[PDB]
Every structure is written in C-alpha cells, then in structure tokens.
Amino acid sequence: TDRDRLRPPLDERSLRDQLIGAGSGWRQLDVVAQTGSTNADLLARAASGADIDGVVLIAEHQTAGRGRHGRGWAATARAQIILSVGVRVVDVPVQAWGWLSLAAGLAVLDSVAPLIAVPPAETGLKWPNDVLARGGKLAGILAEVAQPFVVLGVGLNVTQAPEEVDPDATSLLDLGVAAPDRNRIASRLLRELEARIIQWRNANPQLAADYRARSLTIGSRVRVELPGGQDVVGIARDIDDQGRLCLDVGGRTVVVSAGDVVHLR
Ligand SMILES: Nc1ncnc2c1ncn2[C@@H]1O[C@H](CNS(=O)(=O)NC(=O)CCCC[C@@H]2SC[C@@H]3NC(=O)N[C@@H]32)[C@@H](O)[C@H]1O
C-alpha cells in the first residue's frame, strides 16, 4: 500500500519529446493504461500490416504477460517498466538474431546499474534473458520472431515487490533505490537499447565484449534445464556467434540454443 505512493504514472508526452526526433531512431511511442501483453500487441499490429520497426509500446499495467516457453509474467500497475519495441531484422543473417535478445538484457542492465549505491554480489546477466541483482530477477526479456520483425519485450521491476509477482524476483526499490524515477529510467533504457540494436545490426564486436563483461553465467558451474525436461550439468564457458550457450561437460562441448540456467556453487 505504501509503495503506491512511490508509483506515479509515466509521462507519455515527456518520453515522446525525449525519444522521438532528430538523433533518435524511435518512430512511435505509446503508453497504455492496460493491456494483456505488449509483445502480443506489437505482433498483432505487424500481423495486420503495420511497420513496427522502431515502434515503442509501454504499458502501465499488464494482465496476461508472457514469459519464455509458454510461461507467464506477473505485474501490478505502475510497479514495472513494461515495454515492447519492434525491430526489423530481415537485413541481418538469421544465425545472428539470437544476439538481439542478449543485447536487450545488456541495455536494461546498463540503464539501471548506476542507480544502486553499491552493487551486491550476483548482479549482471544470466543467459539467455535475465537481469539479476543480488541473485534476484530484476528484469526478464522476451524476443518473438515475426519476419521481417522481432518484437523485443522487457519487464523491469522498479518498485514491484517479490510478494506481488514471484519469490525469486527483486526490484530497484528492494535493492535500496528509495525513489526510482520510471520516466528517467525508461528514457535511459530506450537510449541504451537503440545503441545496442545498432551495434547488433552492424555486428559490432563491442556488443559481445560488453555482454561478456556483465555475464554471471560464463565461468559458472550451471545446471541447464532443456526444453523437453532434460537437465545438463556443466561449466559455462562462452556464448557462440548465434547467441548460444557453450558448456564444458567433463571435457565435452555442449551447445544449448535455449534453456533455463541455474547457477550452482
Ligand atoms: N515480475 C516478475 N519479476 C520477476 N520474475 C517473474 C515476474 N513475473 C513472473 N516471474 C517469473 O519468471 C518466470 C518467467 N521467466 S522466463 O525467463 O521464462 N521469461 C521471461 O523472463 C520473459 C519475461 C518477459 C516479460 C515482458 S513484459 C513486456 C513484454 N510483454 C510480455 O507479455 N512479455 C514481455 C515466470 O514463470 C515466473 O516464475
């Protein structure tokens, strides 16, 4: 109840003023009070012929959020930054589209990293889509492919309490950021995201380099829970040029395109 006082609404006009115009690649930005899924919404626009490249959709509340692999995403009003953007990807080799998702998490991380007084342990990126802080899930990323576009979705916990959404979640407020400004964070996030998308489109090596620098997974003992229910235990060593996780399994290399990572002691 007290957190409500820490959840003023977004300022759509201000965001537009900042993010659309010379020097910026964003073409459209809308804030909606409520929707089922911002990712579904942008996919639907594309499916009816809309050019969603550089289109931004932000929702104050999201009632039927989607996670990876048919899972859900929970939210309460004004507690998160919940957005999707459209990205034209057909100009880029299909084998590289996996990196777009990794780039998105990096952008989210960089957009909020400096708000924390001192970064707790286990703060960075968990492959393939998690921004972690103090071991808690601060943000989740969902990339959905609908050539010629990919729709990139971000759910970032700003003041969202774990008790409201998920026991393994955290938020900026729960990390000690007393009065996070969603307007400022949203603007920084989208600016970081534009830069990373440009880097990705041009195969800039700095993208992979910066991702590696923030990886909590690389070098860690991991259990990876594969689509279909199988588990593989090993040590994460690298991310390949397709954005796939490379594991060391007793001296053998196992490359995973999708899975849920658990960092082990
Ligand atoms: N708020 C939360 N914070 C942290 N963890 C959560 C939350 N809610 C659920 N979980 C857990 O996280 C698991 C899911 N983890 S995944 O790794 O499978 N999937 C994700 O994290 C992608 C989330 C994308 C959400 C963005 S938003 C705007 C856009 N439009 C959409 O509809 N989607 C995107 C769930 O099973 C829960 O256990």
Side-chain angles (χ1 to χ4, degrees), residues 1-12 14-94 96-183 185-190 192-264:
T1 303
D2 274 335
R3 291 201 178 193
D4 193 70
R5 306 183 193 272
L6 302 172
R7 298 171 176 171
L10 293 170
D11 187 341
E12 182 188 64
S14 178
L15 291 177
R16 289 176 167 174
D17 290 342
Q18 297 180 73
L19 293 166
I20 305 175
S24 177
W26 304 116
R27 293 197 298 98
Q28 177 182 355
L29 187 151
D30 298 286
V31 175
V32 295
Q34 183 180 321
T35 196
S37 167
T38 59
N39 260 35
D41 293 348
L42 284 198
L43 289 168
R45 293 193 200 164
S48 279
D51 180 353
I52 62 169
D53 184 50
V55 174
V56 182
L57 173 62
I58 308 173
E60 293 281 26
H61 184 36
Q62 188 177 251
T63 61
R66 321 204 289 208
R68 290 179 304 123
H69 305 295
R71 293 185 283 249
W73 188 258
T76 68
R78 290 168 286 111
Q80 295 181 37
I81 286 168
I82 302 181
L83 64 78
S84 299
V85 306
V87 184
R88 189 173 182 267
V89 300
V90 71
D91 55 311
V92 177
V94 190
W97 295 4
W99 262 102
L100 186 52
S101 167
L102 304 184
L106 176 56
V108 172
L109 177 59
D110 279 326
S111 74
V112 298
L115 291 185
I116 305 155
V118 299
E122 195 70 355
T123 299
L125 302 171
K126 175 156 86 173
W127 186 93
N129 72 319
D130 287 11
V131 178
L132 300 187
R134 203 170 277 153
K137 187 158 181 175
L138 177 58
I141 313 294
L142 182 63
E144 296 182 275
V145 186
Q147 82 100 356
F149 308 107
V150 159
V151 170
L152 240 38
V154 174
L156 166 66
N157 296 315
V158 178
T159 58
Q160 193 83 86
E163 63 187 84
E164 287 171 310
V165 292
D166 190 87
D168 291 317
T170 189
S171 75
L172 296 176
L173 174 55
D174 291 283
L175 293 162
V177 187
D181 184 328
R182 280 194 307 141
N183 287 317
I185 295 166
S187 177
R188 283 204 309 273
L189 190 161
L190 286 162
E192 292 284 353
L193 190 54
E194 166 162 322
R196 298 305 188 175
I197 291 173
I198 294 171
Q199 289 170 22
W200 167 80
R201 191 179 304 284
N202 288 275
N204 196 311
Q206 194 184 326
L207 173 50
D210 286 349
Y211 180 94
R212 287 182 164 98
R214 314 299 274 279
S215 180
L216 292 172
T217 302
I218 291 173
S220 181
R221 294 197 60 244
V222 296
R223 177 177 71 257
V224 179
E225 301 169 359
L226 301 173
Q230 294 177 94
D231 297 329
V232 182
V233 173
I235 302 167
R237 300 297 190 193
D238 199 24
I239 309 299
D240 71 16
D241 63 344
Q242 296 188 45
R244 303 185 298 183
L245 185 61
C246 304
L247 301 183
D248 167 30
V249 179
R252 318 295 173 77
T253 299
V254 175
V255 185
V256 180
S257 62
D260 308 323
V261 175
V262 170
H263 297 156
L264 304 173

